[PDB]
Design a protein around this ligand. Structure first.
Ligand SMILES: [Zn+2]
Ligand SMILES: [Zn+2]
Lengths: 176, 275, 176, 248
């Protein structure tokens, strides 16, 4: 299985949006998630305990399926790399200011699971942007037999994102 | 009285426009070339030609204990300059417009055509220069320009250019939409054009394996269809005090390692790793 | 916060108890002594093949997976060898993950011998994680339910950070 | 004759140390009230200036400081100028002399600690501390605007409010180091930076940037000049009033 991941990502994102009755993909983001946009999302999330929330995104594998698209034609060859760097910077800022993000979201109706809420909104906004990009590139055909040489950039940015999440996790844990 | 021993080896001028010579054997000409052209550096254009044509001046950015000094150029576009004036380096689709080829030496016109391909104009010029000595000048100019172009020619081998680096100077502005295409046009850009862009424009960030060094949190120039544009991405242009080429407070303020007033070129991430 | 982390610990115990019989594996005799072998999972691999296994993460959140254990009544001041045992456990877990990542291909041929199916790329990781979680359950059995609401320990957190950085880098290096 | 804050530290005691660690630029009667050594060792900054242009023949050496903070510093290590709420925390009050502790207490409005230290030091020490008071308060009053140019640090006003919260000497230091990204020259607005190099917040001045990672700032092209790699301080929007080329 080297291609089912993309369609399963689409399906699981749709199912999660259904489960939490929220599909606000309209508010595409490039600076920082905010309660100004995701306050109702916080309220919806409070309905169900957010135990299944991870302190990382698995950047590389997460974005790997997007490479499958055929770009023989280039459009994807550069738009995808743009997206990779954008995601890298977005996660950098999110992890760097997670405390600021969580104080803000908590100020919006403090939640016992505030950290879960902030992480989930980060994940959800990223998934919305990713699905918008996937629609932008829905014309291209995903398939295996890859040879990119930009997945090396993907690996590098994934390492950077993992280190950022690592510092974030260390802060959260060490602060009791 | 006369003295001579044997043929001698001397320096090499590495700027393309050094090959500019008047097509006249009876009327001598000497191109104005900066002595920097005689440095075995990536720069295949001398500071004089660079400033004269692309509005750019050479500079060095000494990044460091592990100091690896790297090349960089800087703006010479005035603050009030607009439109075509802002195109720091024209593209093949507009270089004819930016450069008044009609008002310059025909050798220079041929050189610029070679840089931007335009093989049709190149062939027209060669035919005109052949059907009229002038064939010798054809040989000299075209051979030198083509030699430099093939040397640059990043999309080949045997050229000593590609370092397997993955600099993305089309990196998103972070507020534009799904776009860029600067590197698409770069792919289309001539080899000398691409190498000139690489040398002149330093990356905003330097990525080393798992290390990212930040040098400019906002790009100073952009790449678009017209080519390299000396425009601030976010609107209001930076002030550029053009000084040359083309009071008591200060006396009180003795030397304090005064910061330069220039605007170097920052754009993109430069990706290099051990793999 | 760390109360949610205590909830995470109890949840992982109960959820291990749950899936070890929902899928009736409990390969609970194995540990992190060295690289696991398909010879101890043959039938478990057969049962795994009954499900699509792409719903798995290439990287391991070694941080969040192991942090809950750090919460224990170290204030008893009776068994500091317990804390040292935890340090040994975390370090050996990091080594186990690092070796699994380094020789992931080798395990790929192993499970090619054992059940040559396309899902092997996920079966390897599932075996790794499941054996690890059985070891976690055994470690939980060894330790006592002395989990406090909150507990700071700089040394343990630092060890976690430095070992998991290697772990995450190794997992990220799994290119394809 | 020179000028240096913390150079007024006279050997009031016979306790720990004193050698007058003052950079020679203290003799330079610039707009600063602190010299290079003290600036570097108490705010992680280096004095610098900047010319502008000869279009109107101004070329004024705009005052500015250099970041001495790398991209790995966090929190306190990244704070350049602490607020009155955090200066005590960032500064090792137990390391510096009680004279410098008094200077910090005065400049940050901690007269309670000032008097506490005075009373403790009383047991020639009292008169020497009074001399320190005289020098420090003279400097503070000189910097204080309250006596006989819309340099917004927020517009490019919470930031300006924080700057105002700073003392006269501290406000002078902030305005001398920081350089607005925008400067109006009496009805001609000029942009000099497309981005900021520092941020003013509740904790005080921080060598941070609006977004992304921190600017990298560490401690054979021989035939070409060099461009400095360090990061100067940049923040705000200043407007010059109805005044001529006031080279005075
Ligand atoms: Zn030349
Ligand atoms: Zn001094």
């Amino acid at each position: 299985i080297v291609n089912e991941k993309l369609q399963k990502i689409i399906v699981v994102t749709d199912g999660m949006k259904r489960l939490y009755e929220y599909c606000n993909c309209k508010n595409s983001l490039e600076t920082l998630p905010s309660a100004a946009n995701y306050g109702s999302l916080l309220k919806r999330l409070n309905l169900y305990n957010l135990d299944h929330i991870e302190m990382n995104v698995n950047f590389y594998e997460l974005l790997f399926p997007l490479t499958l698209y055929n770009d023989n034609d280039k459009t994807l060859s550069h738009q995808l790399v743009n997206y990779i760097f954008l995601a890298s910077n977005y996660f950098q800022n999110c992890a760097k200011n997670f405390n600021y993000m969580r104080e803000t979201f908590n100020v919006f109706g403090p939640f016992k699971q505030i950290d879960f809420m902030v992480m989930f909104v980060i994940k959800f906004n990223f998934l919305c942007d990713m699905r918008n990009f996937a629609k932008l590139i829905d014309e291209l055909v995903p398939n295996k037999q890859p040879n990119m040489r930009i997945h090396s950039v993907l690996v590098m940015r994934d390492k950077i994102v993992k280190l950022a999440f690592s510092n974030l996790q260390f802060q959260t844990f060490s602060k009791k | 009285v006369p003295v001579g021993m044997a043929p001698r080896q001397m320096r090499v001028n590495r700027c393309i426009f050094a090959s500019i010579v008047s097509f006249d054997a009876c009327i001598t000409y000497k191109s104005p070339c900066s002595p920097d052209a005689y440095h075995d550096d990536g720069w295949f254009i001398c500071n004089n030609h660079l400033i004269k044509r692309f509005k750019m001046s050479k500079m060095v950015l000494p990044i460091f204990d592990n100091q690896f000094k790297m090349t960089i150029a800087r703006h010479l576009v005035g603050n009030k300059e607009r439109g075509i004036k802002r195109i720091l380096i024209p593209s093949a689709t507009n270089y004819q417009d930016v450069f008044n080829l009609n008002s310059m030496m025909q050798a220079e016109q041929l050189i610029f055509h070679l840089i931007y391909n335009n093989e049709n104009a190149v062939n027209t010029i060669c035919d005109n220069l052949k059907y009229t000595n002038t064939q010798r000048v054809i040989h000299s100019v075209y051979a030198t320009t083509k030699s430099i172009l093939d040397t640059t020619n990043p999309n080949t081998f045997c050229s000593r250019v590609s370092r397997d680096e993955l600099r993305f100077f089309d990196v998103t502005n972070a507020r534009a939409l799904r776009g860029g295409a600067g590197d698409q046009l770069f792919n289309n850009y001539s080899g000398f054009l691409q190498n000139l862009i690489r040398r002149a424009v330093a990356p905003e960030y330097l990525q080393i394996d798992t290390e990212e060094l930040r040098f400019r949190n906002c790009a100073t120039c952009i790449i678009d269809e017209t080519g390299l544009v000396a425009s601030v991405p976010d609107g209001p242009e930076l002030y550029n005090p053009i000084r040359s080429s083309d009071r008591e407070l200060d006396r009180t303020l003795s030397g304090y390692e005064e910061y330069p007033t220039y605007v170097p070129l920052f754009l993109g991430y430069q990706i290099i790793n051990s793999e």
